[PDB]
Design a protein around this ligand. Structure first.
Ligand code: HEC
Ligand code: HEC
Ligand code: HEC
Ligand code: HEC
Lengths: 235, 254, 190
């Protein structure tokens, strides 16, 4: 049905293979236009998410663009301590660091990446340079598709992003059918990581605190029932 | 008690029973929970739950028993009858399938009755081979001589008597001569001479032993007069199962 | 109180009692899923309509359901689970409540007419163990179809799409078999 993720609930600590797949997808597809400045590269070793091997992290970092410096202007080797690059303009898009919170979030990305079908039977010509999406709601609409008072008759609208993937864009090393849907789910989970890395710690803290406070509250209820006994016994 | 009496009856002002209260409230709470959980949610079903559970039931069933059917499908019908693994499971279940779907026309025994063939026996109208039986099952299934001017009231009687002779020997001399002549002319084309019958047509052999079919002179007169017209409905729509059933029916005779 | 007030008690009762009916029944008139016929489906042919009335008169419904539930075993036994669209034309609806005999919803070809005749004539004859009553009279009585035009006209008024042409164009055993043969067929072919 709704294709719920793993983390959608009181449990679900970010199944990591899914995140490694999303990383294969993000660095080879989405990175061409998008960036994640709010994301340090070293986080690809921190627990909770992709617990990759540090050495591979340093390699992948040195293999990225050149972030010059802060003290002496000079194109450095881009050490992991720096942040992911930033694609800013000239046919590029926003930053995906926290896009999983600026919208139930990841379901938006899934049902957005999912859905770029051809132009409907109201404006088949479409638009030059703009492509159609069935779920983006903040895009333009031709006058042919609007109602009598400016509202659109289409489910979604026209987004400036092209279709990101075809039937079998990339291979998975673990062994898995790399259709469009699985890639969309995986990349959605990866972005949710990039936004909420400390999710599992959140849930564990919540459990511990609920327990301890229920205990404290029960003990206080007993103490209250006791103290207030000689005044609530005859009635 | 309260102040007013209604003919004899008076009523105590008493409290609602605590348990009664609790149960009432609990039911209400359950109802709200149910509504939130149902259509208005529950996990496990993506989108919203519905009768959609049907798909899940079928799907798990398919996963569980798909292999058994799939293994059988590759095997030829003849092989699926022989082998007690598939082949024996094919007779009991094919036999299982048989009872649910086929038994109502062809008998629990598969022996048949008047108007329906006995599947157990050796005799086959359409042909006994595996392919034939399968075809009968998968795609499903006699000219009215009374009218054809020549046949008439008398011609039919004669042909009936003659056929009973092909099948065995009654004694009626007029009903024999005439009938032989007519059979050779017309009947023989589909049933052959000496009534071997033709499987292609589904024309049964006239030279048979005592079967469930109306052997009597009168019954033969009726089938000759009015003709046959029996159907074996196709299981291709309703029914893999057809294959197992073919294997079962085949296994039945031998 | 309101104990004392006859009108108040009456009014509140009428009000209290109404809510479920308004909430459950009324919205159904509006909902399309229950209103829409299966696309392929057409109204019952005059013989089938007459036969359906016979099915009603006899009391077949009292032993036979015409509603397949969405379970695997019933799907296996009966066929595709019944859809609201199938019953759109049915005034009144035939869904069962009891299955003394098996479910009739999808006998869209399952048995031959000949079988149906023999069985209706004497169920025990074909199915020795059957509880079903014998209906030989069906053979005995002929249909005049005087009324069929009126019936279709009324159904059209009720919403069934009979053409003027259909009305104009329009034994009991024959009718019953005709009716039985149509059941559940609409979905399968469409
Ligand atoms: C350039 C060729 C792109 C690549 C490859 C990807 N994206 Fe992108 N994206 C791009 C543009 C120009 C825009 C702006 C669209 C607009 O109409 O303003 C976007 C937008 C997005 C968004 C935001 C949608 C919203 O509701 O605002 C998302 C969530 C997004 N893109 C996701 C995404 C992913 C996961 C990609 C890799 C699989 C990807 N995009 C590639 C440009 C380009
Ligand atoms: C009543 C509608 C029947 C249904 C239900 C089943 N069968 Fe049948 N079958 C029926 C008739 C009246 C006949 C004879 C048709 C004719 O030639 O007049 C048959 C024939 C067969 C055969 C062919 C037998 C032969 O001699 O070649 C087979 C193999 C057969 N039927 C199989 C079969 C199965 C497996 C069924 C359940 C799925 C089944 N039949 C149901 C009548 C009816
Ligand atoms: C061509 C087709 C013919 C013609 C010319 C004849 N028969 Fe008949 N016959 C034919 C078929 C396909 C069947 C099977 C009918 C069914 O199963 O529904 C039959 C059947 C009979 C039978 C009945 C056998 C039984 O009791 O099960 C008889 C007695 C019979 N046919 C006789 C008969 C005679 C006397 C004919 C010449 C007048 C004759 N057939 C012609 C096919 C065909
Ligand atoms: C109560 C007893 C009834 C009555 C009122 C009707 N039927 Fe039935 N029927 C009944 C039983 C116990 C069975 C099973 C045994 C058997 O097959 O004879 C049936 C069966 C049928 C069937 C066959 C269904 C199938 O096997 O798919 C049909 C088509 C059928 N009955 C029709 C029917 C009609 C038209 C009735 C009103 C005249 C009728 N039945 C009444 C039990 C009962």
């Amino acid at each position: 049905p709704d294709h719920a993720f793993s983390f959608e609930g009181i449990f679900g600590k970010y199944d990591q293979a899914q995140l490694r797949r999303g990383f294969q997808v993000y660095n080879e597809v989405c990175s061409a236009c998008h960036g994640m400045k709010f994301v340090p590269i070293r986080t690809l070793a921190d627990d909770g998410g992709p617990q990759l091997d540090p050495t591979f992290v340093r390699e992948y970092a040195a293999g990225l663009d050149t972030i010059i410096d802060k003290d002496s202007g000079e194109e450095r080797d881009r050490k992991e301590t720096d942040m992911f690059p930033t694609r800013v303009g000239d046919g590029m898009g926003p930053d995906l660091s926290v896009m999983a919170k600026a919208r139930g979030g990841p379901e938006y990305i899934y049902n957005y990446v999912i859905g770029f079908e051809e132009n409907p039977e109201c404006a088949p010509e479409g638009i030059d340079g703009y492509y159609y999406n069935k779920t983006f709601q903040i895009g333009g609409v031709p006058d042919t598709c609007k109602d009598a008072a400016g509202v659109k008759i289409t489910h979604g609208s026209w987004a400036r992003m092209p279709p990101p993937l075809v039937d079998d864009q990339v291979t998975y090393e673990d062994g898995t059918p790399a259709t469009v849907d699985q890639m969309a789910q995986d990349v959605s989970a990866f972005l949710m990581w990039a936004a909420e890395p400390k999710l599992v710690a959140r849930k564990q803290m919540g459990l511990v605190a609920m327990v301890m406070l229920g205990l404290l509250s029960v003990m206080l209820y007993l103490t209250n029932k006791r103290l207030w006994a000689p005044y609530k016994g005859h009635k | 008690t309260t102040g007013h009496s209604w003919d004899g009856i008076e009523e105590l002002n008493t409290p609602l029973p605590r348990w009664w209260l609790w149960t009432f409230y609990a039911t209400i709470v359950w109802g709200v929970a149910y509504s939130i959980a149902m259509p208005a949610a529950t996990p496990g079903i993506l989108g919203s739950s519905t009768r959609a559970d049907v798909e899940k039931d079928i799907a798990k069933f398919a996963e569980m028993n798909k292999a058994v059917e799939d293994k059988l499908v590759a095997t030829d019908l003849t092989a699926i009858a022989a082998d007690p693994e598939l082949v024996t499971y094919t007779r009991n279940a094919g036999a299982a399938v048989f009872r649910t779907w086929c038994a109502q026309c062809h008998g629990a025994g598969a022996g048949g009755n008047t108007g329906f063939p006995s599947l157990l026996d050796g005799d086959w109208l359409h042909g006994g081979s595996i392919e034939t039986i399968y075809t009968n099952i998968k795609h499903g299934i006699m000219p009215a001589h009374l009218t054809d001017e020549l046949l008439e009231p008398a011609q039919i009687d004669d042909v009936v008597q003659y056929v009973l002779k092909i099948s065995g020997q009654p004694a009626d001399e007029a009903r024999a001569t005439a009938g032989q002549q007519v059979f050779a002319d017309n009947c023989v084309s589909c049933h052959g001479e000496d009534a071997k019958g033709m499987v292609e047509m589904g024309a049964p052999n006239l030279t048979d032993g005592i079967w469930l079919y109306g052997g009597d002179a009168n019954t033969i007169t009726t089938t000759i007069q009015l003709g046959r017209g029996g159907v074996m409905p196709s299981w291709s729509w309703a029914a893999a199962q057809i294959r197992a059933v073919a294997s079962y029916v085949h296994s039945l005779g031998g | 109180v309101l104990e004392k007030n006859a009108t108040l008690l009456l009014i509140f009762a009428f009000l209290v009692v109404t809510i479920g009916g308004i909430v459950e029944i009324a919205p159904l008139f509006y909902l399309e899923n229950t209103i829409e016929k299966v696309e392929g489906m057409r109204p019952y042919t005059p013989l089938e309509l007459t036969g359906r009335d016979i099915y009603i008169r006899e009391g077949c419904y009292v032993c036979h359901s015409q509603m397949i539930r969405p379970m695997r075993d019933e799907v296996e036994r009966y066929g595709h689970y019944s859809l609201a669209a199938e019953s759109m034309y049915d005034h009144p609806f035939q869904w069962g409540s009891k299955r003394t005999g098996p479910d009739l919803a999808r006998v869209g070809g399952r048995y031959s007419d000949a079988w149906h005749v023999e069985h209706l004539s004497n169920p025990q004859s074909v199915v020795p163990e059957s509880v079903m009553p014998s209906y030989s009279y069906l053979a005995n009585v002929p249909l005049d179809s005087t009324w069929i035009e009126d019936r279709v006209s009324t159904d059209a008024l009720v919403g069934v799409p009979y053409s003027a042409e259909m009305i104009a164009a329009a034994t009991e055993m024959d009718a019953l078999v005709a009716y039985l043969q149509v059941l559940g067929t609409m979905v399968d072919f469409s």
